[PDB]
């Protein structure tokens, strides 16, 4: 049954919540294991199967089960979504196995040990995290720090058989990718992606042409960023449960902010919320400009995804 559901791993709108239930709250381990097998990454990179499972289970453990959105289910969802975006025809044979590995690894660790509050909340409450990271991409630096540190636990180094050059290069790409998931960088990341689409070059086979590191990492950065912002592009029954979860986490932060005499962050005030209006807002100003730009990059590969996003936007609008 779980094996049956894991057959949809190459499809957008995989039912990740059912996989979480059917796997005993291990969506991240089973989805990553499935993907690594499907891409033959264990053979390519000589990853012992027991090492892979041991690391995935430790990594999954360090997502908070009592955080409603930023948990191991979100992590599995972003992994799988990145996996599908990597298979788009316009990117066929563009990225190396190592780059593919970096973007999937980055997706899996990208929110680990997220405590359920935003960077700004952690800065304004003079948290230990904000003090360690000097108010700059506080959460994103921590996700990386944890995701790499766990590689050193007993039988957890899934990269043990990479060359030195391979390890160095993967590490840098993973850092570059996860630091780009910081929402405060969205505008500059989208602005760069627009520029790339406007000067887009394709090869004789129709595939996207990426000459240099800068272009290659920027596509992988925006790819994982799109995967991170992909809830509104999924089938509505999935999207709605992500909205429920984000609003619970947001409202909880807002209660803490109220208790402390702070101003409540946008969308965190449960006595003054408009869930539907905000999803429409967020899609119109953030999610759709990004996905429309990605759709242009990989035209027409992403047309169904963009269509689903436009329907979901219409549906949320219709309930106001
Ligand atoms: C403060 O800005 C805002 C903001 O401002 C208020 C506003 C902005 C524009 C607008 F039009 C309406 C409201 C509203 C926001 O609304 C969201 C809605 C969401 C989700 C969000 O998370 C994205 C994933 C995060 C992760 O995986 O970590 C976000 C945001 O992150 C967000 C941010 C960004 C955060 C910053 C700058 C710190 C996730 C799932 C769905 C789509 C179901 O719902
Ligand atoms: Mg994050
Ligand atoms: Zn995330």
Sum up the structure in keywords.
binds magnesium ion, globular, 3',5'-cyclic-AMP phosphodiesterase 4D, binds zinc ion, mainly alpha, binds the ligand COc1c(OCc2ccc(F)cc2)cc2oc3cc4c(c(OC/C=C/C(=O)O)c3c(=O)c2c1CC=C(C)C)C=CC(C)(C)O4, 320 residues, monomer
Overall description:
The protein is an all-alpha fold and 320 residues long. The chain has one domain (1-320). Helices cover 63% and strands 0% of the residues. The protein has helices at residues 2-5, 16-22, 27-39, 41-44, 49-61, 72-86, 97-109, 119-124, 128-133, 138-149, 164-179, 186-198, 213-228, 236-259, 275-297, 303-318. The radius of gyration is 19 Å and the shape is globular. It starts with a helix and ends with a helix. Magnesium ion binds at residues 111, 139, 181.
What is this structure's SSE topology?
Layout: H1 2-5, H2 16-22, H3 27-39, H4 41-44, H5 49-61, H6 72-86, H7 97-109, H8 119-124, H9 128-133, H10 138-149, H11 164-179, H12 186-198, H13 213-228, H14 236-259, H15 275-297, H16 303-318
Helix pairs in contact: 2-3, 3-5, 3-6, 6-7, 6-13, 7-11, 7-13, 10-11, 11-13, 12-13, 12-15, 15-16
This protein binds the ligand COc1c(OCc2ccc(F)cc2)cc2oc3cc4c(c(OC/C=C/C(=O)O)c3c(=O)c2c1CC=C(C)C)C=CC(C)(C)O4, magnesium ion and zinc ion.
């Amino acid at each position: 049954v779980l094996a049956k559901e894991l057959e949809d791993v190459n499809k957008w709108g995989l039912h990740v919540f059912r996989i979480a239930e059917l796997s005993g709250n291990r969506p991240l381990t089973v989805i990553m294991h499935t993907i690594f097998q499907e891409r033959d990454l264990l053979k390519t990179f000589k990853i012992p199967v027991d090492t892979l499972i041991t690391y995935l289970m430790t990594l999954e453990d360090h997502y908070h089960a009592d955080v409603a959105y930023h948990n191991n289910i979100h992590a599995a969802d972003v992994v799988q979504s990145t996996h599908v975006l990597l298979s788009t025809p316009a990117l066929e044979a563009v990225f190396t196995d190592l780059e593919i590995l970096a973007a999937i690894f980055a997706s899996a660790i990208h929110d680990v040990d997220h405590p359920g509050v935003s960077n700004q909340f952690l800065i304004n409450t003079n948290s230990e995290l904000a003090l360690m990271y000097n108010d700059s991409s506080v959460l994103e630096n921590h996700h990386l720090a944890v995701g790499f540190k766990l590689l050193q636990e007993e039988n957890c180094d899934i990269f043990q058989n990479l060359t030195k050059k391979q390890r160095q290069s993967l590490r840098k790409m993973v850092i570059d990718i996860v630091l780009a998931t910081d929402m405060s960088k969205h505008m500059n990341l989208l602005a760069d992606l627009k520029t790339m689409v406007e000067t887009k070059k394709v090869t004789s086979s129709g595939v996207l042409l990426l000459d240099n590191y800068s272009d290659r990492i920027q596509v992988l950065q925006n790819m994982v960023h799109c995967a991170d912002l992909s809830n509104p592009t999924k089938p509505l029954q999935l999207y709605r449960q992500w909205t429920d979860r984000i609003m619970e986490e947001f409202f909880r932060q807002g209660d803490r902010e109220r208790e402390r005499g702070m101003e409540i962050s946008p969308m965190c005030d449960k006595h003054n919320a408009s869930v539907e209006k905000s999803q429409v807002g967020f899609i119109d100003y953030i999610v759709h400009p990004l996905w429309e730009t990605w759709a242009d990059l990989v035209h027409p590969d992403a047309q169904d995804i963009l269509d689903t996003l436009e329907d979901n936007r219409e549906w949320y609008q219709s309930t106001i």
